[PDB]
Amino acid sequence: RRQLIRQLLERDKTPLAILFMAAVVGTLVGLAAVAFDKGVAWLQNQRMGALVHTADNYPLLLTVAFLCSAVLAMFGYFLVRKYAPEAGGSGIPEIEGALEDQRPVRWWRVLPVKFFGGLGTLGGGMVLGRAGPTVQIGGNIGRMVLDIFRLKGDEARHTLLATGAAAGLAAAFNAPLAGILFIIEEMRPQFRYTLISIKAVFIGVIMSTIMYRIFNHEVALIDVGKLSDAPLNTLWLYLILGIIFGIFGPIFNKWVLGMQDLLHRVHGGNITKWVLMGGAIGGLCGLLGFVAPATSGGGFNLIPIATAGNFSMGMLVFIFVARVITTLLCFSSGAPGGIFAPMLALGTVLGTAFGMVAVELFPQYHLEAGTFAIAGMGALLAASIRAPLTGIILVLEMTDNYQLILPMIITGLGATLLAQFTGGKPLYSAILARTLAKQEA
Amino acid sequence: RRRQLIRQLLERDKTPLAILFMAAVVGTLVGLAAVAFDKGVAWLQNQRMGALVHTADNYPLLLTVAFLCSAVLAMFGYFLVRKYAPEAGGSGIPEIEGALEDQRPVRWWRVLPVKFFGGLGTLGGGMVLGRAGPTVQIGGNIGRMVLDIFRLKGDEARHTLLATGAAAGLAAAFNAPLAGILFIIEEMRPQFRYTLISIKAVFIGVIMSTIMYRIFNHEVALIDVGKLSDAPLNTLWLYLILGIIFGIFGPIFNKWVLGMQDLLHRVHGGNITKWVLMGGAIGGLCGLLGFVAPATSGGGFNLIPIATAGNFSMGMLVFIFVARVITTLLCFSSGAPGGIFAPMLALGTVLGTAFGMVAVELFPQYHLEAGTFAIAGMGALLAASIRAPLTGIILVLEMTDNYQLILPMIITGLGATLLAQFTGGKPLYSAILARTLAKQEAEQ
Ligand SMILES: [F-]
Ligand SMILES: [F-]
Ligand SMILES: [F-]
Ligand SMILES: [F-]
């Protein structure tokens, strides 16, 4: 229908102003995200220097461990509850909401709350990720420049809010492709056509990523080395593993949803018990972060160690269980901060474990557990969040093990296929569902 | 629509188990078809090289069996297209794009044999054409056919199995799974309205397709380029400059192919016999060139590792670029079966290499390697002619494994699309589809 013929001849003509403004969004979200990340790090730092100041009296130092974190945690629970509730939890359900035009981007409130609130809960050493925070911060940045410059239209509101969020993923993980992919596979409205210019999201993601490289060059977030290739007669192991991730995904999805409810009892909704709960979780974490640091924190540190088979089978069973616990706690409590990255650490440990059984069950295959570690790494993403293409492309950008691309994709699909066949749902879709339903009811 | 949204969010990613199993089937068949296509094209280029040795003395006799061998295989492919499947002329990407708009018909009983055997002619003869088009149309048609055969009803199913055939078709062509999946969701899928295409199922298609390729292609890369040097932040501004160069060149290239499409239409007028004859003449020029200056002819994949590695003179790069622009325009604008996608990789590499060269001398403080610019230029003519930058970026990544080049690769790609937008240019597949949808009415 000729309408088409007119459309094909007018394809990819993004309004110059939407382009130039993406340049500024990415830049700002870039610096913001760098600053966030540098911030978080500095406080985990001080906490380490304070444990040295009191390095002798074991119960004293077990106390300043708890307290430095407990206090920082409360500052974050508080800052959210008092000024910006939409900035509790992840921030991706929220930004997805915004692109649907079913949630308000209150940038004058969320930027400072999420930034300094994230700073506390993360910097205190809680099991939460930078992924939600940075995407929320970035969409808000993008909304804020839309306002300030008074850009009018649907395309301008949707695009700038989108490039903002891709750039915030790009910057937090040094993952320009994964940034771009997360917008198209998860973030943009899933059930209707939208006017989100891709070339504009790209530009935003470049400037965001460059900013990261100005302040972070020479050191990568994960360094795993170059691992062995994967023989064709080995793949069916990767299928079995994605199946294991694909049954676990939904179960872990039930648990985050339920535990949200069961933590919502403890405080009833009340800013004083809610802040006091948060600093108990906060204290528990900063305490865990000294007596068994692998059960606490973001968990990036234990990834290269798991991938190189440097853990024993027991330690991995612990670390995994310990972390399912400290993940549900930290995230289902309402604290500002994601579940995304802490899934990276869970996916890795699960894999490495599976690889270890493969190595001893099939020595003819000449296996390396680190190759199951790397396929598992983003399998939880694929199985819970249900965004496999982004899960895969992200791990690719962080490990540089491209010869593993088939094992990674097979574990991915095996994950998303069993998640779907066991009634699980996209977690960030479930959360935005819960929030829209509790809204009109 | 808040209540419809809650209903919809909770019902997300629930692809009908039937469509998932079929994507598996489409994958596998496309994979095999792509491998068979790849091996068949290779066997003819090889026989042809066997004949040249059979006659390796008498130069004019050998310059003659060089011509006739291509000429015959060319005609045979032109003929099969004009006689049974006109839609299988050109690339086959505009076509499967049409089919995704429900504006073009997937006549798989006629296209599979025409595209396959007629591509085998034009590529195997040694013409300048890519595998991407052919294996994409082929793959989508295979998709259609398992749709018909199994009588799957749905709008989902038709678009899905049509999309997983195109994706499995690009994946198996380049050993590039990610590139295939991404080509669908950036370029192939209908651009101006919502659609019911399951990505999960396209994924399964792509997996199976790539596994088939690995069963019959293991241990030997399409492009080995080795690991190259990194790129420092103060190098970036140079890639942006290279993107811009591509960005103004992209559209200029696009006009020639459209133009050359017309000017060649005059030589035959529509006539199956001049067209076949002309095709066999073009063909014979290529098979001749393939012996007397091989880098000016054929797929291009051979001279990519060479260029990336600095082994060409600036005089050779300039020579190869111009002759190749010329022969790529001859072959694709003549409407033989075969795409323009892959030969744009080669053109791009060469152009970048050339730039890397001049960047190396002009700035020894930077410690450059021409090959980092060759690699950022590989998927750049893609960026500015075909305007699918996320695809050529992930494509090149998958084929050269040089991830540390990600920033310059992006940057150059973006630079290309922006200057391609800004100077009037359109997506090439979209402008070919359009000229065809418009012709659909022109004679009314
Ligand atoms: F996160
Ligand atoms: F999260
Ligand atoms: F091609
Ligand atoms: F093509």
Coordinates of N, CA and C and ligand atoms in Angstrom, one line a residue, chain B residues 91-93 130 132-134 332 338-343 429, ligand 4:
Chain B
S91 N 19.4 -8.9 -5.1 CA 19.9 -9.5 -3.9 C 19.0 -10.5 -3.3
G92 N 17.8 -10.1 -3.0 CA 16.9 -11.1 -2.3 C 16.7 -10.6 -0.9
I93 N 17.3 -9.5 -0.5 CA 17.0 -8.8 0.7 C 15.8 -7.9 0.6
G130 N 27.6 -11.0 -3.5 CA 27.6 -11.6 -2.2 C 26.7 -12.8 -2.0
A132 N 25.1 -13.1 1.0 CA 24.1 -12.7 1.9 C 22.7 -12.7 1.4
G133 N 22.6 -11.9 0.2 CA 21.3 -11.9 -0.5 C 20.7 -13.3 -0.7
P134 N 21.4 -14.1 -1.6 CA 21.0 -15.5 -1.9 C 20.7 -16.3 -0.7
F332 N 25.9 -6.2 -9.8 CA 24.7 -6.1 -9.0 C 23.6 -5.3 -9.7
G338 N 22.2 -12.6 -6.9 CA 23.3 -12.4 -5.9 C 23.3 -11.0 -5.3
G339 N 23.6 -10.9 -4.0 CA 23.6 -9.6 -3.3 C 24.7 -8.6 -3.6
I340 N 24.7 -7.5 -2.9 CA 25.8 -6.5 -2.9 C 26.4 -6.3 -1.5
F341 N 25.8 -7.0 -0.6 CA 26.2 -6.9 0.9 C 27.6 -7.2 1.2
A342 N 28.0 -8.5 0.9 CA 29.4 -8.9 1.2 C 30.5 -8.2 0.3
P343 N 30.1 -7.9 -0.9 CA 31.2 -7.1 -1.7 C 31.4 -5.7 -1.1
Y429 N 18.3 -1.1 0.5 CA 17.4 -2.2 0.3 C 16.0 -1.5 0.2
Ligands
F4 F 23.2 -8.2 -1.0

